[PDB]
Design a protein around this ligand. Structure first.
Ligand SMILES: [Zn+2]
Ligand SMILES: [Zn+2]
Ligand SMILES: [Zn+2]
Ligand SMILES: [Zn+2]
Ligand SMILES: [Zn+2]
Ligand SMILES: [Zn+2]
Ligand SMILES: [Zn+2]
Ligand SMILES: [Zn+2]
Ligand SMILES: [Zn+2]
Ligand SMILES: [Zn+2]
Ligand SMILES: [Zn+2]
Ligand SMILES: [Zn+2]
Ligand SMILES: [Zn+2]
Ligand SMILES: [Zn+2]
Ligand SMILES: [Zn+2]
Ligand SMILES: [Zn+2]
Ligand SMILES: [Zn+2]
Ligand SMILES: [Zn+2]
Lengths: 371, 371
């Protein structure tokens, strides 16, 4: 479910140090993925405030409902002896957060997931508008530790084993939803503790990035986009797309697809410490430009992945962030032809000291499933 | 899945009028339950901004990723011809929100679910710190329309049918989790389109409000707290708790439980237009005080319910909101004895012109299941 307490003790210290280096009095983390990362808590109260208050200096405090007290034994909080301030319905828990930071006025950063419901009254209680914690917690969470790389690698190998099972699911007459049920079951069977998402976009639906699956039946000649992932304990994601053709594709489809393959490969080959996120997006986008296809490449090249399917860093135009070793993100260019077909090639890669490691290794060619 | 477009046209106009009456330039609704209520959208992009921009005056605008364009046909947005501003990865969509409101500086309110990720850059783009939309949208969403009352009533009758099936699940030796699987299946069978939550707190776990279910086996003498709900199309919740005893309880348990029953009944009897939320909480809390039990009543008396299990109004100490007809909330006092047992009696009620209608009607007595 979670890492040893020592892992969290070390994340908490590193987070406090970076908060101090950013000149803030502290961080305020309500439930979600930053909390899970910082103390291993899967708590989520919703309208009732639970928050980890991590001062730049001194002992952290957990503010939470008294009725939730037993949740402390679940995460690392109890073992580390963080201060607890439980409150009862009728209390203003925002005042407890202020006090745990030394009292208003206090300059803080908040987890980017904190809802307005809490953020706006927190701002009043603190006397200072919070800034996003993303610049602070980024330095930690986007640089994966050895054990996190390992979990992503095992999730990647597992999702690869699912993609190997996909061609036998792709039979004319079967609906996208029957394929998706077969895939969901295989996601679990191959070792993920849960299904994250299943996308099976056949024929025209492959051109539609919002599409999940439906009752459309596979036809001979369909290009089928398959984008799938699961979680691997203690909660890291796989996320890989491969495109299949039901019977031989046409020459035009084959040629444009192979430009996409070159684009994807070239973005993967550009991954090194020191190159910018925007340079990696440029590497895919330039090849597709040169083949005359850039207008059909309607999204960013990739997103970070870890405890969430989508996180820092973003491999997108305008992102000047230099890449460093241990960053994990997708490389997933695609081309989309509204009403006709689409294709996407997606790997998760991990930055190494002199390049990248792909944790997804299925063939990159368009797989031709016989009819 | 959703209401006729006319229902949303009317919610949008009423929301605009209240926004103007509050002196704001407009509302900004990112994905979640306010969006579902306002235009019937189940969209959720996450780190990419989707927002309904509802000016105090003039046509609303949807700001969303170009890659999500097809989602517009899913909700009422396309039928009502709202303006669309799609944007591409690399763009700052917060600038589009500002412009749709006439440009910075713009004073707005935001859905209480909006995450910091969007709220903090939105605040900069708008030139003015947003306030919570809860005071505006409250006037709409906490007053249920006839069709919403109907959906809650059908969900309530369905969850009652589940509670009727619960005694036969409660057999010594069976684990809480096996009971919970039986309940989850019955939730669907009785007509809910999905399970919302299943709580089976037996023996000591009944004293623990954070508890869901576990591998603890039911024992003779256990008091079992059962708190369960599902959704009913187009997405309204049931939420009802009843307490069971495995074989006759002891005289002390029986006596204290009947004080809880009186407390619950007295909060239900106090529900009328014009009484305050805090007076309704007082009605339950005073009876439990008088029996000497108030210190074991460790939470608010109830919460609003509708498209979410937890919403406005909150039936809690300090809430001065006068109740009006069509409000829907739980009445759910409980008493908790750490390490020993707990009990909770929970109904959803709807305020009527001269009182309340309960949509949950299972017996309020402690049900004694034979061993
Ligand atoms: Zn809640
Ligand atoms: Zn302390
Ligand atoms: Zn974050
Ligand atoms: Zn279709
Ligand atoms: Zn979508
Ligand atoms: Zn991806
Ligand atoms: Zn993907
Ligand atoms: Zn290859
Ligand atoms: Zn190859
Ligand atoms: Zn996302
Ligand atoms: Zn327009
Ligand atoms: Zn709301
Ligand atoms: Zn236990
Ligand atoms: Zn809880
Ligand atoms: Zn409830
Ligand atoms: Zn309940
Ligand atoms: Zn009764
Ligand atoms: Zn009775």
């Amino acid at each position: 479910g979670r890492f040893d307490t020592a892992v969290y003790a070390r994340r908490l210290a590193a987070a406090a140090a970076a908060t101090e280096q950013a000149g803030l009095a502290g961080l305020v983390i309500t439930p979600g993925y930053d909390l899970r990362y910082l103390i291993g808590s899967r708590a989520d109260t919703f309208e009732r405030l639970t928050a980890l208050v991590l001062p730049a200096s001194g002992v952290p405090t957990i503010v939470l409902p008294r009725l939730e007290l037993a949740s402390l034994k679940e995460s690392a909080a109890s073992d580390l002896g963080v201060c607890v301030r439980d409150w009862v319905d009728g209390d203003d828990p925002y005042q407890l957060v202020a006090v745990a930071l030394g009292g208003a006025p206090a300059a803080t950063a908040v987890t980017d997931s904190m809802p307005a419901l809490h953020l706006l009254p927190l701002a009043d209680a603190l006397g200072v508008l919070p800034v996003l914690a993303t610049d602070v917690l980024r330095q930690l969470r986007m640089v994966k530790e050895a054990a996190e790389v390992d979990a992503l690698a095992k999730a990647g190998a597992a999702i690869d084993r699912v993609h190997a099972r996909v061609p036998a699911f792709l039979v004319p007459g079967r609906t996208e939803a029957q394929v998706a049920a077969d895939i969901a079951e295989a996601i679990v069977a191959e070792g993920h503790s849960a299904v994250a998402f299943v996308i099976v976009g056949s024929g025209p639906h492959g051109a539609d990035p919002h599409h999940g699956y439906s009752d459309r039946k596979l036809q001979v000649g369909d290009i089928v986009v398959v984008d799938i992932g699961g979680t691997y304990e203690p909660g890291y994601y796989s996320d890989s797309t491969r495109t299949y053709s039901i019977g031989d594709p046409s020459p035009d489809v084959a040629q444009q697809y192979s430009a996409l393959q070159r684009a994807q490969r070239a973005a993967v080959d550009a991954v090194r410490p020191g190159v910018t996120a925007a340079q990696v997006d440029a590497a895919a986008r330039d090849v597709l430009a040169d083949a005359g296809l850039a207008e059909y490449f309607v999204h960013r090249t990739g997103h970070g992945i870890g405890l969430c399917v989508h996180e820092e860093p973003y491999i997108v135009a305008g992102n000047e962030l230099p890449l460093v070793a241990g960053m994990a993100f997708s490389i997933e260019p695609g081309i989309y032809f509204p009403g006709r077909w689409g294709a996407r090639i997606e790997d998760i890669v991990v930055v190494t000291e002199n390049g990248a490691l792909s944790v997804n290794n299925r063939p990159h060619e368009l797989m031709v499933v016989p009819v």
